[PDB]
Amino acid sequence: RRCCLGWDFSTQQVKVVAVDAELNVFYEESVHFDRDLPEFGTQGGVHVHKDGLTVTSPVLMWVQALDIILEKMKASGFDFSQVLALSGAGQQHGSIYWKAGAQQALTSLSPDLRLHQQLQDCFSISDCPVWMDSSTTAQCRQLEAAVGGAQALSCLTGSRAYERFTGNQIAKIYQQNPEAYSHTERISLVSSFAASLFLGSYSPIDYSDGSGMNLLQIQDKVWSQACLGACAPHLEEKLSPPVPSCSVVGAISSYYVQRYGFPPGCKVVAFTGDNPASLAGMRLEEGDIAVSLGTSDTLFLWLQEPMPALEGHIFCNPVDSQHYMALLCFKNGSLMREKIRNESVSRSWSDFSKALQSTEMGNGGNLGFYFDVMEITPEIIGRHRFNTENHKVAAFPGDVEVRALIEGQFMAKRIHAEGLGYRVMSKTKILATGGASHNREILQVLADVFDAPVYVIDTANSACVGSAYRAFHGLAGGTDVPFSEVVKLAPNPRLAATPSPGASQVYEALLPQYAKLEQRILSQ
Ligand SMILES: O=C(CO)[C@@H](O)[C@H](O)CF
């Protein structure tokens, strides 16, 4: 049983899966930060600072967690001699600042000691900013002004300036702690930091996670000189050139060979971000989209031809370096669905389903926008309801309300995805995951709106699994072969719904009416 390992250096834990060559997951293990390393005093794996905006994690907690998990695997009897290759994912945006002289410690690791003990003094910043940090608003505004505005930055990097994006965090560290910045020889993302631990030398950053920094020119796949210069000095030499995601960055360090019994030929495939790795785990191809339903709803799009905007995030594609992917986040998700269920259908998901069954596609032309909290895609708040003559109304009947919510939420996902360059194709598959993916009637509206089949998939280990798939892709030929042909044998998702007859005719007319009403609300 030969295998690849798929790692996930996440906010709350370090996780690993072992996938065999038939692409079956046969082993999983994890180390949970608060529970297993309580000495760091984290909550949710992070430290929220007094200001309520600065959010960090101690770098050495992530190092120590890797030591614990490898020893936990050993103690369970995991056969490391069977590992042909490995890759992994990192929580996006988060950064590691390596102190001058740290690569000498990485390259001289002794198998008799743990990583934590040997890399103890290798970091110029002990508390790493993570994806939850929102303390860099001034750096965001300065970065945008320096390059010609929010739209100019997005065209260049796939996103306007976001507080959590790495370049804004590097700028804040350079401004507030210039001494630590001057003593930093290398800056890694969580993904490339974790790859560096397995190599025993610095890994480059990949194109895909490299796209979550407001630094990489996504088109030319080179660092933007204007973005680098607007954040901190000598930054390019600290980052090193970025590489295609399907790159063998080196063999595993002899440290792991001697300490754990990994074979010396075990290959380390470039790590990537957790969202890009989940896209690989979900096996999205051209024309596909995944809908992650939850407290926030997240759209994962494949993009051949990107159109960066003031909303969403375009990244270089992890499984096809010539194309792209995008994330679109919706703040009004499951709480909004639960509130409408409670108000209109007697707190019953069954009556919620029956309201969708008992109403026609297009809802008689009744359209609704439901934003009890300020929405981000787009920036609107309030509930806004319109009847078949496009007149604003105060309320709908209960059943109409349920369909207006579900049908509007899915039409918005389609409209905002097309704003970034996405187009439904004859090959299109829609993948759905999360709480609301357990409701057939909700998934039917989704199938009708996009005029494409919907499949349900469990994604709890999507980043791990996607990483093991990418490791297998590197062994099966890398850039010489399509990722999709390597993973064709992986488990297929179950088909949940297919568009009803006439759905295309209904939504071809209704989608432009919904988009016009959205623009009407934004302007007024
Ligand atoms: O900030 C995010 C995406 O831009 C998150 O999904 C982090 O990757 C979670 F770790």
Swiss-Prot record:
Lineage: Eukaryota, Metazoa, Chordata, Craniata, Vertebrata
EC number(s) recorded for this UniProt protein: 2.7.1.17
Catalysis performed (reactions): D-xylulose + ATP = D-xylulose 5-phosphate + ADP + H(+)
Function comment: Phosphorylates D-xylulose to produce D-xylulose 5-phosphate, a molecule that may play an important role in the regulation of glucose metabolism and lipogenesis.
Database matches in InterPro entries: ATPase_NBD, Carb_kinase_FGGY, D-XK_euk, FGGY_C, FGGY_N
Binding site for ATP: W349, G435, A436, N439
Coiled coil region boundaries: none
One of the protein's GO biological processes: D-xylose metabolic process
SUPFAM superfamilies linked to this entry: Actin-like ATPase domain
Protein name: Xylulose kinase
One GO cellular component term noted in the UniProt record for this chain: cytosol
Complexes and interactors: Monomer.
Family that this chain belongs to: Belongs to the FGGY kinase family.
Binding site for substrate: H93, R164, D274, N275
PANTHER family registered for this protein in UniProt: SUGAR KINASE, XYLULOSE KINASE
One example GO MF annotation: D-xylulokinase activity
This protein's UniProt keywords: ATP-binding, Carbohydrate metabolism, Kinase, Nucleotide-binding, Transferase, Xylose metabolism
Key word Iron-sulfur present: no
